């Protein structure tokens with residue numbers, strides 16, 4: 001049957017087109033792929049002055065709110081903190097969140113099994129005028145985090161500038177690339193701000209813009225903490241010039257339920273010696289967690305992948321022809 | 331032969347069964363896979379008081395034994411330390427491990443090529459009553475780690491509480507999930523402890539339980555340090571409801587031979603100014619290294635993967651039928 | 661035809677040889693593969709004395725130039741720094757890089773939008789004898805990083821010793837391995853330096869040797885900063901003894917163009933209290949960024965991968981025979 005022959009030829013044409021069109025070109029089979037080695041470097045430029053009630057103005061610079069000062073892909077930017085100054089080790093009252101005692105007989109000498117705040121001496125001392133707490137041994141100024149200021153202390157950190165330095169290199173092809181490209185020059189970085197469409201190559205990122213691109217409001221993240229995920233893509237083709245290789249930045253919002261465990265927070269201390277006595281300052285920092293992940297793939301022409309793809313295409317064409325013959329045979 | 335025909339049918343059915351079940355149901359081939367972006371948040375709530383000989387009691391709160399206070403997937407929990415207080419720079423004796431001198435002629439001015447402890451002045455000073463060491467320019471109180479206390483100083487860190495907050499999101503499906511599943515509530519986290527069977531969803535992990543589940547003893551590990559690997563896997567099917575997404579916590583023991591380089595240790599210093607002189611406190615912290623790695627995949631029904639799997643199954647079926655025909659013809 | 665059959669037999673033999681020769685053995689199709697759980701531990705040794713102009717000799721031990729003292733795969737080794745001591749908050753002049761004012765009317769009260777150094781009070785004060793800068797509210801001693809010393813301060817860090825402790829464990833096969841192997845003993849670690857050919861198993865890496873193996877000169881990296889990428893490979897076969905499993909170290913140079921943002925640098929501060937006044941020391945550290953990434957694969961004999969590879973080879977052989985028959989047909 002002439003019609004049957006035409007159908008067989010048509011099937012052959014479709015599969016032949018598919019192997020050259022998709023496997024060879026869309027999937028870039030003629031090229032080999034390998035991994036890269038990336039190093040993330042971050043730098044902040046911003047200053048926020050927070051005036052605490054009953055205390056002098058406090059100046060914070062890049063070294064203050066950037067706790068990973070050495071440089072890492074995962075860093076926290078301080079936006080709100082609770083300061084407990086002049087802490088000293090001694091016998092004093094604990095926080096009321098642990099327990100409330102009405103007499104000395106209720107207190108038990110020892111340490112709490114869960115959420116321990118210190119070594120209980122065994123006496124009930126008044127925490128304030130109304131309630132009384134157990135007497136413990138340790139830092140007497142307790143971190144009273146029951147009251148969180150609604151206005152963010154470091155609210156100026158919204159429209160600051162963030163610089164990300166990423167250098168990637170493919171060991172198979174021995175090609176090294178950096179986030180700074182030929183289009184980006186010295187004068188450009190002096191005034192550019194990163195944008196999704198306008199300035200995709202500007203390495204100066206705005207914290208508020210980064211938070212808004214992920215889908216989160218900066219006010220709540222500055223108040224109670226947050227997590228922002230940043231991803232850098234390096235998919236490119238090595239057949240063209242290295243100028244075409246440009247990184248693509250994507251921002252993802254990592255958030256959960258607001259009722260249980262809202263935001264991100266931690267604690268750190270600064271130990272010092274004043275008047276011959278060891279003292280420290282404890283801070284409950286509510287900062288935004290920034291995570292940077294780099295992943296990319298590069299392809300360059302090679303003969304062995306091309307031959308393997310040609311063989312696979314010939315095999316698929318043969319299998320398709322045999323299946324078409326079996327179907328036409330019925 | 332009727333029997334030969336039956337054999338052909340039997341092979342044909344079994345290959346069809348394999349494509350129908352293993353390829354689909356088991357492998358979720360009709361479902362696409364994509365990576366996730368994860369951010370690890372850790373918080374400790376424990377207190378240990380160490381009372382060394384010759385010094386007052388020292389209280390170590392969360393800000394003390396957690397050196398990565400900012401928060402990272404890789405953190406060290408202090409369990410044992412060697413304190414060398416009131417260090418000041420000057421010309422004084424070195425450690426006996428560097429070298430032993432019997433006269434001033436044996437000492438050579440300069441710096442040691444390997445394991446240098448300071449700049450030698452060229453004089454031999456007595457380290458103690460018996461032996462003499464080279465005079466170097468550096469911190470006079472030399473950390474002598476020859477004696478390691480068998481009882482762990484921060485031995486209370488065994489049954490403390492560790493909270494791990496992990497937020498994962500898939501960019502392909504735009505679905506965000508957190509380790510705090512809907513089954514876990516606020517009252518549940520107040521008194522729950524993680525267990526493989528009892529409480530698999532409780533985000534509160536006990537350090538001693540984590541060490542026991544890794545095939546290690548907490549005492550011998552904390553005596554000299556160690557490394558514990560924690561892996562969180564997110565294997566869920568997006569075809570069902572989002573409540574089915576439940577993280578899996580697995581603990582792996584990363585240990586080596588104890589005869590060569592036992593445990594894990596490091597050194598850090600706290601710089602301060604006392605009486606107009608710059609001093610510091612050096613600690614050789616023997617702590618357990620905790621590494622948290624998150625890796626998971628998601629699967630949702632899609633048309634293109636389903637069509638590709640159907641085509642591959644049809645091709646495999648045709649190839650199997652042709653091979654059976656060729657074998658039966660011989 | 662005889663020659664046609666001879667050519668056919670030859671081709672079928674060649675494909676059969678290929679499947680057993682390459683897919684089965686070269687590719688180790690029979691074995692199953694899985695990932696590992698790695699944990700990098702680093703420890704530095706060495707001392708550098710930087711005698712600054714008009715200041716006493718400063719001793720820098722391991723805890724000083726190693727900012728990630730707790731231990732991490734990504735760490736920075738200090739090689740050059742700019743010290744700005746005795747910083748205190750107050751009203752004073754700013755850096756000339758922010759702006760130059762000739763009168764008090766030019767200054768505007770508030771904070772700079774980009775590269776902010778403090779809160780301007782609206783007054784123009786002379787920074788030095790020649791030029792005048794805006795008056796800000798913050799740390800009065802400004803980090804004047806216009807002059808970078810050409811000789812590296814911590815130039816002794818070139819030929820120091822770096823020890824890397826890596827423990828990997830395959831969860832599928834329950835096999836734990838460490839960078840220390842049976843060939844490496846206690847006496848060997850006392851005196852050895854890592855080499856590409858001589859000492860591939862010595863865990864003591866020289867910083868200068870690591871920098872030179874990556875293709876970068878250590879002098880420029882100590883002067884203005886640099887990034888060095890280290891990779892550890894754990895490809896091995898579990899069919900043999902565990903002694904054959906040996907790590908392979910590869911060093912990669914991560915660098916960019918020298919005109920725009922050359923090297924790596926950061927800033928950190930050490931807070932202290934002297935004479936009842938809060939002070940700090942700011943340092944602009946020019947250090948080399950070391951990134952350690954571990955990846956490996958282990959294979960062990962299994963029956964299911966062997967059967968799948970045999971089936972795939974039989975299918976490929978059948979497809980090749982069918983294609984040969986079709987070619988011989990016409």
Ligand SMILES: Nc1ncnc2c1ncn2[C@@H]1O[C@H](COP(=O)(O)OP(=O)(O)OP(=O)(O)O)[C@@H](O)[C@H]1O
Nearest residue numbers: 043044045161162163189204805920921922923925
């Ligand atoms: N977070 C940031 N915001 C704005 N500009 C930045 C930021 N980080 C770096 N830059 C600019 O990029 C240029 C090149 O970066 P480089 O690593 O040389 O910084 P630097 O000059 O060492 O730092 P500094 O400008 O504080 O002296 C610098 O002129 C710097 O001003």
Ligand SMILES: Nc1ncnc2c1ncn2[C@@H]1O[C@H](COP(=O)(O)OP(=O)(O)OP(=O)(O)O)[C@@H](O)[C@H]1O
Nearest residue numbers: 145260261262263265373374375491492493519534
């Ligand atoms: N290591 C831990 N052990 C036990 N419980 C913890 C731990 N970390 C956090 N939690 C509890 O989980 C709940 C949610 O965590 P969240 O991040 O809100 O801490 P928080 O309430 O801000 O800290 P705090 O309880 O010190 O005020 C809190 O009630 C907290 O007490």
Ligand SMILES: Nc1ncnc2c1ncn2[C@@H]1O[C@H](COP(=O)(O)OP(=O)(O)OP(=O)(O)O)[C@@H](O)[C@H]1O
Nearest residue numbers: 475590591592593595703704705821822823849864
């Ligand atoms: N950077 C380094 N260069 C050379 N040798 C090192 C280095 N770090 C550690 N080592 C050696 O490796 C051996 C085992 O390491 P381990 O973790 O036991 O150190 P340690 O003995 O606790 O510390 P230290 O050697 O400072 O007393 C030690 O004998 C140590 O001297």
Ligand SMILES: *[C@@H]1O[C@H](CO)[C@@H](O)[C@H](O)[C@H]1NC(C)=O
Nearest residue numbers: 096097127128129130131146
């Ligand atoms: C005392 O502290 C408790 C702690 O919860 C608080 O409820 C109470 O209002 C405090 N009383 C005064 C007078 O501050």
Ligand SMILES: *[C@@H]1O[C@H](CO)[C@@H](O)[C@H](O)[C@H]1NC(C)=O
Nearest residue numbers: 155156157158159160772773
């Ligand atoms: C937003 O950016 C502008 C810069 O034009 C700045 O003046 C302003 O303070 C920023 N907003 C906040 C809340 O910091």
Ligand SMILES: *[C@@H]1O[C@H](CO)[C@@H](O)[C@H](O)[C@H]1NC(C)=O
Nearest residue numbers: 182183184185186187188189
């Ligand atoms: C600086 O870079 C920008 C990139 O947007 C480019 O448009 C501009 O021409 C560059 N300047 C010079 C002087 O090359």
Ligand SMILES: *[C@@H]1O[C@H](CO)[C@@H](O)[C@H](O)[C@H]1NC(C)=O
Nearest residue numbers: 426427457458459460461476
């Ligand atoms: C002196 O120090 C050396 C150092 O190893 C030690 O062996 C010796 O016992 C010490 N002597 C006394 C009396 O402490």
Ligand SMILES: *[C@@H]1O[C@H](CO)[C@@H](O)[C@H](O)[C@H]1NC(C)=O
Nearest residue numbers: 112113485486487488489490
């Ligand atoms: C074990 O946990 C209990 C809590 O029930 C605690 O009292 C005890 O101190 C813990 N053990 C150690 C060695 O800390």
Ligand SMILES: *[C@@H]1O[C@H](CO)[C@@H](O)[C@H](O)[C@H]1NC(C)=O
Nearest residue numbers: 512513514515516517518519
């Ligand atoms: C709290 O969570 C637990 C999970 O084990 C659940 O059994 C319990 O019902 C929850 N409590 C409430 C009040 O929902």
Ligand SMILES: *[C@@H]1O[C@H](CO)[C@@H](O)[C@H](O)[C@H]1NC(C)=O
Nearest residue numbers: 756757787788789790791806
């Ligand atoms: C004053 O500071 C400016 C800042 O750039 C500098 O150019 C100038 O040389 C300085 N003058 C003196 C006398 O140091």
Ligand SMILES: *[C@@H]1O[C@H](CO)[C@@H](O)[C@H](O)[C@H]1NC(C)=O
Nearest residue numbers: 442443815816817818819820
């Ligand atoms: C190179 O190593 C030698 C050790 O033999 C050391 O003396 C020398 O100071 C090192 N060079 C530098 C520049 O530190």
Ligand SMILES: *[C@@H]1O[C@H](CO)[C@@H](O)[C@H](O)[C@H]1NC(C)=O
Nearest residue numbers: 842843844845846847848849
């Ligand atoms: C120490 O290890 C080295 C490895 O190069 C080996 O040659 C030497 O024999 C070992 N020493 C002892 C005492 O086994």
Ligand SMILES: [Ca+2]
Nearest residue numbers: 067068398728
């Ligand atoms: Ca750190």
Ligand SMILES: [Ca+2]
Nearest residue numbers: 272273603933
């Ligand atoms: Ca001090």
Ligand SMILES: [Ca+2]
Nearest residue numbers: 072404732734
């Ligand atoms: Ca890290």
Ligand SMILES: [Mg+2]
Nearest residue numbers: 097144145146
């Ligand atoms: Mg609280």
